Ligand binder design. Structure first.
Ligand SMILES: CC(C)(C)c1cc(NC(=O)COC(=O)c2ccc(-n3cnnn3)cc2)n(-c2ccccc2)n1
Length: 291
């Protein structure tokens, strides 16, 4: 295929970062990858096992290459020469966004972030970048089907990027409802038409962003954490909706409710939601203090 390739001798593994059921991730040095950077760090996902998995690897590499954008996960290329098959990603300091949110919550500094909880303007900065990525995917008419903070990485300078990780099914297994045997539905992020009728569209993606907007202002709490999976399915289908968090100002909770309209056709577009959040994010301290 028309993906970029990387020679094994340029890659040098340092240590393991994480281990899913279908993939290990390592930190590694990569030589001669970029022009200005002779020696840079990278994340290296190694494929596990099977003849069926070799095809899924192929599909990922193609999708990732053609769907590159400032706020989508950065992908350099593969290493086909000799097993195991490697995928080279850009290394992201702070890990996934859920972990980052939990570590800087109201439960009581650093290089990238001030001490204590994240500020209103900092929270809105994260919401805007995640929103910016969904405008790009909506534009090309690709549906994510599993948008959450656990599938968002954070880097140096608090740069946030959207992805889709198989490690999330192991680390955050509680966030999925198992069905059939090998299927896993993230019911707490899904709209009514997805749960009942099993239809996923761009409108079903906006609902999930509303739930992602709720995650951020709760500093990474699970939606409907008090309810079990079956209790949560009853709750969403019967039209009951999440509360406004303590950190969330009224103006921002209006944007969540905007995403949560029952009939899909009456929900707001992702472009208009981004417009509000980016405008709100870049607003001056005088405006945001009275917000
Ligand atoms: C563009 C979008 C969102 C539609 C998409 C993206 C992916 N694939 C990924 O996200 C994969 O990423 C990593 O494996 C990864 C692991 C570890 C790291 N890192 C840790 N520390 N630093 N980096 C960084 C990436 N898709 C996919 C498509 C088909 C099948 C499966 C997945 N679909």
């Amino acid at each position: 295929a028309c993906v970029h390739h990387i020679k094994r001798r340029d890659i040098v593994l340092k240590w393991e970062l994480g281990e899913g059921a279908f993939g290990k991730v390592f930190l590694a040095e990569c030589h001669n990858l970029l022009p200005e950077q002779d020696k840079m760090l990278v994340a290296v996902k190694a494929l596990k096992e099977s003849e069926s998995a070799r095809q899924d690897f192929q599909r990922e590499a193609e999708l990732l290459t053609m769907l590159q954008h400032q706020h989508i996960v950065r992908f350099f290329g593969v290493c086909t020469e000799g097993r195991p098959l490697l995928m080279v990603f850009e290394y992201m300091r702070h890990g996934d966004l859920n972990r980052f949110l939990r570590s800087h919550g109201p439960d009581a500094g650093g290089e990238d972030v001030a001490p204590g909880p994240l500020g209103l303007g900092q929270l809105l900065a994260v919401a805007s970048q995640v929103a910016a990525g969904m405008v790009y995917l909506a534009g090309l008419h690709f549906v994510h089907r599993d948008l959450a903070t656990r599938n968002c990485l954070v880097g140096q300078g608090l740069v946030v990027k959207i992805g889709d990780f198989g490690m999330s099914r192991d680390i955050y297994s509680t966030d999925y409802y198992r069905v059939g045997g090998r299927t896993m539905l993230p019911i707490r992020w899904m709209p009514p038409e997805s749960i009942l009728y099993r239809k996923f569209t761009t409108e079903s993606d906006v609902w999930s962003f509303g739930v992602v907007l709720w995650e951020i202002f709760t500093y990474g709490k699970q939606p409907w954490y008090q309810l079990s999976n079956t209790e949560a399915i009853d709750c969403i289908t019967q039209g009951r909706e999440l509360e406004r968090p303590r950190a969330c100002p009224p103006e921002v909770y209006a944007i969540m409710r905007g995403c949560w309209q029952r009939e899909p056709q009456q929900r707001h577009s992702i472009k208009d939601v981004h417009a509000r959040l980016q405008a709100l994010a870049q607003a001056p301290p005088v405006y945001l203090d009275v917000l």
